[PDB]
Amino acid sequence: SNVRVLATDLAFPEGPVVMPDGSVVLVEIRAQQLTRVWPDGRKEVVAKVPGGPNGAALGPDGKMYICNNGGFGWMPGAPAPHEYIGGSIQRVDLQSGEVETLFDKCGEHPLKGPNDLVFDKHGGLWFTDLGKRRARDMDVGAAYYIKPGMTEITEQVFGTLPLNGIGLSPDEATMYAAETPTGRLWAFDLSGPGEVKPKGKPICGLGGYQMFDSLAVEASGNVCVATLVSGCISVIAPDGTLVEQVPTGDRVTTNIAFGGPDLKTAYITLSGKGELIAMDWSRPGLPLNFLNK
C-alpha cells in the first residue's frame, strides 16, 4: 500500500471517476463544480454544477451523470432554506460543460438529497437518496432506478435510514447500499435489471461509532466502503464478513474508485483534508459499465 497524494485544496471532494488514462473527474461539493485532475498534477474545472454535486458516474452517452443533493450548509451540515435548491439527477458534457437536469422528482415526490449512483450493463441507473436534515427532523433514505434510455424513474427502496454508497455485484444480481449513521451495508436481491425482489437485509454492521459513506465493488465481489469517524476503507465480503479495514488518515473519508493497471489502484477522496489520494490495492476492482468495459 504505497500511498500518494494526487491533488490538494479540493473543496470537499467526492464522486471520483477514474478514466482509462488515469485522470480523475470528481465533484467538489462545496465549490459546486466538476473537476478534472491529471496525473501530471494539473487540475481543470470541467463544469460548474450549482447546488450540491455529490456523486458521479460516466454514462453510455459519454456524459457524466451527477447526483445533486441540492446543497448543504457549511464540514457540511443541514442546509438553511436558501442554500437548498432541490435534489436532482443531472448530466454534464465533459467537452462543453453544459449541465442538463434530468429528474427532480419520482412520481409526485421531489427528490431530496441524491448521493451516489451506478450504471447497470443495460444503461439503467441506480442511485441513492440520503435525504435532507432539517431543524427538528430528517428525511428517510431511499434508492431509485432510472430505466435505460432515461425514460422512467422508479422507487426501489424506501424508508431506511439515509443511504449513501451504492454498487452492483459483478453479476449485477445484487445491489448494495450503505446506510450512513448505522455503519450497515445492505444487500438487495434483483429479480432482473432495475427491480428489487423482497426488501433487503443488512449483511454487515460495524461496531463502535463508525458511519458509512460511498463505496466501490471489487472484481472478487467484495464491497469497499468509505468509513467515516474511524477513517478507513471497510472491505466487506459478499457474505458480510469484514475482511479488513485500511486506514486512510482522514476521519472524513468519503469515496473510493478503482483504476490504473488491472484496476488495482484505489483512488480515495479525503474530504476533510481536501485531498484526492491513490493507494495500491491487493485485488482488482470491478470494471464499471461504460467506463472500464
Binding residues for Ca(2+): 14, 115, 164, 213-214
Closer residue to ligand SGU (CB): 14 or 129: 14
Nearer to Ca ion, 116 or 120 (CB): 116
Pick what 216 binds: ligand SGU, Ca ion, Na ion, none; C-beta below 5 to 8 Å, kind-dependent.
Na ion
Binding partner of residue 76 among ligand SGU, Ca ion, Na ion, none, CB cut-off 5 to 8 Å per kind: ligand SGU
| Number of neighbours of residue 36 by Cβ within 10 angstroms | 17
Q: Is 216 in the site for Na ion (CB under 5 A)?
A: yes
Q: Which is nearer to Na ion, 16 or 274 (CB)?
A: 16
- Per residue, what are the HEC states of the chain? CCEEEEECCCCCEEEEEECCCCCEEEEECCCCEEEEECCCCCEEEEEECCCCEEEEEECCCCCEEEEECCCCECCCECCCHHHCCCCEEEEECCCCCCEEEEECEECCEECCCEEEEEECCCCCEEEEECCCECCCCECCEEEEEECCCCCCEEEEEEEECCEEEEEECCCCCEEEEEECCCCEEEEEEEEECCEECCCCEEEEECCCCCEEEEEEEECCCCEEEEEECCCEEEEECCCCCEEEEEECCCCCEEEEEEECHHHCEEEEEECCCCEEEEEECCCCECCCCCCCC
Q: Which of 72, 4, 8 is nearest to 35 (CA)?
A: 8
Out of 213, 250, 262, 280, pick the active-site residue: 213
Is residue 164 part of the contact set for Ca ion (CB under 5 A)? Answer: yes
- Which of 89, 206, 257, 266 lies at the binding interface for Na ion (CB under 5 A)? 257
User: Shortest approach of Na ion to residue 289 CB, angstroms?
Assistant: 13
Contact window for Ca ion (CB under 5 A) among 19-27, 67-75, 109-117, 142-150? 109-117
Q: How far is the CB of 180 from ligand SGU (least distance, A)?
A: 7
* Listed ranges 102-110, 152-160, 247-255, 260-268: which one lies at the site for Na ion (CB under 5 A): 247-255
Task: Tell me if 129 contacts Ca ion by CB under 5 A.
Answer: no
Residue ranges of the binding site = 14, 115, 164, 213-214
Q: Is 104 designated active site? A: no
Q: How many angstroms separate the Cα of 252 from the Cα of each of 78, 103, 131?
A: 17, 29, 19
Minimum CB–partner distance for residue 213 and ligand SGU (Å): 5
Instruction: Give the x-and-dash track for 181-220 against Ca ion (CB under 5 A).
Output: --------------------------------xx------
Nearest residue to ligand SGU, using CB?
254
* Chain contacts with Na ion (rule: CB under 5 A): 214, 216, 255, 257
Which residues form the catalytic set? 213
